Symmetry: D4
Subunit: 205 residues, 8 copies
């Protein structure tokens, strides 16, 4: 599996002249105001991935941010609620053309309450995600090989997952539902950054 490791940014957009890009991040934790962005992962869906180490205090990443702001390119996430928050917090740009495989799973895999990436990859693709490195020092100057393979695996399969979920959403006639959820997702991420992360804004109480 070809995994290209970069410092700071993509060197160019040559591998991403595409309509959709799979995106994930690694951080020091779940709290974007405390836990810095450490890694950004990308794949075009061709079976290879880019792993971008983000430095402490890094304010800019122009090639990555070009993709994030390109409205001709759908940003595919698994649980984009988190990735959108830390990406917009770090580089100042919120994507507004997105697809989330966790939301799509909640709308289509109605026979389960297990919507994690590992569960979804195994059921839909018979692909085994190993989570051992999720709890690791993502701020390390040199990521280990196990870390780099794990980070790549978070984006290697999102295109294939999106294709299946799009088929399920059509079959169950839920495309307009999903579209509305993906349209609000960036604001749900902004709500988290502004201080409503523990609040379901739509709940009665």
């Amino acid at each position: 599996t070809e995994i290209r490791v970069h410092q700071g940014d993509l060197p160019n957009l040559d591998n991403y002249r595409i309509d959709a890009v799979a995106v994930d991040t690694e951080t020091l934790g779940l709290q974007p105001h405390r836990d810095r962005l450490c890694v950004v992962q990308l794949s075009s869906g061709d079976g290879t991935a880019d792993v971008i180490q983000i430095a402490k205090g890094q304010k800019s990443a122009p090639n990555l941010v070009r993709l994030l702001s390109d409205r001709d390119i759908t940003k595919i996430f698994h649980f984009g609620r988190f990735d959108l928050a830390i990406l917009a917090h770090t580089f100042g740009v919120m994507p507004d053309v997105v697809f989330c495989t966790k939301i799509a799973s909640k709308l289509t895999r109605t026979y389960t309450d297990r919507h994690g990436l590992k569960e979804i990859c195994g059921e839909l693709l018979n692909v085994n995600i190993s989570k051992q490195q999720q709890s690791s020092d993502w701020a390390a100057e040199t990521l280990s090989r196990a870390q780099i393979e794990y980070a790549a695996s978070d984006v290697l399969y999102l295109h294939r997952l999106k294709d299946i979920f799009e088929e399920r959403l059509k079959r169950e006639e839920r495309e307009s539902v999903a579209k509305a959820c993906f349209q609000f997702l960036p604001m749900r991420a902004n709500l988290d950054l502004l201080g409503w992360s523990e609040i379901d804004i739509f709940a009665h109480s």
Copy 2:
């Protein structure tokens, strides 16, 4: 005393509703729209009067009411519009797409409390006392009691005033775009409820 006009089935006309925004509430036989039928629709133009419309069992249309609901030039003001939107679309087939919800607005602005119900908000923002005693009553009754009628009217008589104050706070705290986005999703949150996700926060990790 408040002028309350009680109607059977529909408004007789829209002469009182050539306006920019209308306050709306419903009463039902309970919280489950597939089991508990729409019983009452309440409306107010914001002038201190209200219309109380009794909806019959099995009633499939309400042309004048549905006209307002579909009018993109009229903002429908709800308190917890998530519920009213679901039952209204379920009963008459039309989902409003221009809304303001004082419950969402409260959660975005009254950040110093966890109490976001209508009674609490009217008391704090307007010194108005809402009595909830009739909230649990037979809303399907053929003749509503005066207490039911006055309580149903009270749910819509203050929403314009609440919306004015919440708009001031949204602007003061720079949250107008957040609120607009939430209102834009609210009809789809209501449809999610009707489709079978009423117990699921669709944006949660688990």
Copy 3:
């Protein structure tokens, strides 16, 4: 008025009727530990019979005839309990029953409060005072407060049943309610047999 009896009704002169309201008072909620102390009856006419049951009493032929008579519907509020302590004490389980709590749950769909006090207040504007519910129901002489409270448990069940029957018809749930009432005695039996903490129909 309220007629107080020891042991049994003297006769059935006041119960040549098609439906009778029934409630019980006990020393607590556990029939195998907490004996039956009182049985209250009403014909619906605004009078009640309050029957004190002795410790160790195993028979009351006039009361039990009513409980056994399939031509008389026994009206309860939460008959699940009364059916159990009555069957446990006298050995007979009534099988023609109406329960206002089940009726409430099937019709007052806008609330989770289905107790007798809430129901009497909402449907009849009648105030039930629960202060004597926690009292020594086994006292040889009941206080006037206990007697009037015990009577109030049965004075309004005919009127509640009439309104609930109207609502069950309106919402087209009559056959559902009938099936629930039909199972209620077996639900009471399940309680006496050891399943009182188990919803027998739940997945877990």
Copy 4:
């Protein structure tokens, strides 16, 4: 051994001139108004099973429904509360002669709180049920062999379980209790469909 797979309906009832039939279903989830019926499984208890795929929007299946309506044939379920709801919701017919092994288990296996099909088959028959395919896309146009074999395993043993539970119900003198529970079960399923699925209708509060 033999699993016969059908589309739409049984071709006939040649294999079901019997006095009791084992029945299970598969759906897109637990919510009958949202999650459509996808598969109906049947067994005569002879070690063979019929697995019938149900199409989206299909509201009839005359051979199956004749069995379900036949008052001379007991329908054996495990947790019939669910199957009765989705069958009645889909086909318009509510079976009224039933046996449920889950209810039987709660009335006889008084030394445990584990009343699932897997646990009962292990204990009473030394038969292993694998539940890996319980969470799968039962709406698939073509089921996998693992799905088909799992679905069959839900009905292959219900006759044998019913025979043991009947022995136990007799031994502990609970036959009338079980019969009354089975008699109310179709109405408990109806209550679920009408909106009381989260309410123990017999509870005090």
Copy 5:
């Protein structure tokens, strides 16, 4: 009338009796942290003695005589606590006790409310006011409200014990209650030794 003492009773002239009502006040529920502040006594005659216990006070010989006197039953409400703090402070564990809280749990089977205020209200129509329960019981001079409150904890235990004895006999639970009172000093010891959060008889 309430007699307020410093340190100890002056004599036992009021306590040549078969049973004495006892309660305590402390700085809190933890005996190893929260010192004994007050000890209250009543002979049952409608008067009380309120004894302020000083910080570091190691003895109270007249009080300890009553506590050690095998011919005098010590009546407590929730003796489990009083026995612990008394034994920890003065070194003596009473072994002849009656506890109205245990007695209530064994007889008032129609409720889960077994506090002293609830029991006095139901059995005696006596109103206990708990306002001073949270107050500085180590104060050098207790307020009148504190004093009256501390006395109210012992003024009615004789009358309660009499009713509870009647109920225990009626329901045939005397030997059960006696066994519970027999173990209560060791339950208190278990608390002092480090098991205050453990039901020693529970399966888990």
Copy 6:
């Protein structure tokens, strides 16, 4: 491992001319008024055991009851609260000379909250209790070899556990505490039968 299996009662007391006997029971469940006594197990501590099947409706077991009544013989249980209740409920005699290894564990193994028999046997004796048959039909006319061996394991080690616990109670100076707990245990079992099984009679609330 020698296990003698009896119907109804011991044939005689020749193996139990001893100062202490280990006792356990098997039933159809945890509820003595619903779940009948099925098995009584006994051991003298010599590495052998007696397994006594109790018939439905059996009201008498004179040899077993002579031991339960013999004040010169300590009855050793693990969690005797249960065995005392079902034994007194079934045959009418409450033992009053008892040692409980669970209570002893709670008073000595202060470094853990795991006081089950399997945990204690592993830690104190390096003996492996297998609980697979705990959930089984103990009313069966013919018990399986696995059932009989498991039932025997419940009594084969209680003497050795008692000796160790007695040493620890002495070392930590808690002998009089344990003695009072054992003295009250028959009444705790009685309280259970009378209707307080869910109530800690000594709790503030």
Copy 7:
């Protein structure tokens, strides 16, 4: 009758605070300092008078108030200083480091209760009734109501008296050094909150 001096932005001078200890409290738009701005700072010298300082949105300095908060010769008295210290440090950039907290003091002396709120403490120790009606109010309002102003003043008018009593109790129970150590750590506990550990007991095993 209680004299309350209301200021915009800052104290005009320190003439009323040439003292050894100052009572301090704050009002905000809520409990989350990164979202909910500092709206009011209240001060009292213990003399029965109070100063109520309205803080503007985006205000970053208040040099006279901040001098008080930085002056190591002046103990700042708080009730639940954990919160005030965090919002004050977040807003003005200075963390006070000589503090007394009546809530910590209460937890170490009122061992017979789990109710350690200011209302509860004032009633028991002083027979003073604190009314909490305005706690949930719009503290960012341009003009505070008389009710809000009197409530804000009441948070500081009694803290000197509470501190005296708690100091007596801490000496009596021989816990002065414990309290001192808790106070010394309190600014770091507040800093931990601002840094992202507000929901974590940093000293707990799990």
Copy 8:
């Protein structure tokens, strides 16, 4: 292959502990210091060897150990020193005041996890397997088993290495002063436990 020196009562001398920091753990009869006596004290210099000291019932002194514990020129490294500081001070009358706690350090650096136990941290940072089987055993045994001895030694063999990594991370994330204030309060937090606040977060609002 691991040199573990076992002693009764005390170290025989301090020849192996002329060092700047010593790793310490304890074993007891349980988590309650007033009921559950000190049974073992373990030490390591960080050199791959350990000392395991059995403490007798009722023993109140251990002069060589206590000299180390009192030496302000030597940092005592603990994992969850809150517990060890309590039982050591309770048993020997001396409260160490120069300390490092790897559990607190983990909570301040391993921000991506709620698993801060010694086994999880050893596995993650060092790829070292801690086997907890003997944690539930009779530590008051007159003769400890080889398994008990090896387990006890494993609690202290790696704390120097953990300390060095956590120090790197505290520097990197700029939290050194935070950690230092936490370590500074930790002896008083242990004292609070001994005095009766072991179930109370003294800094919490409620």
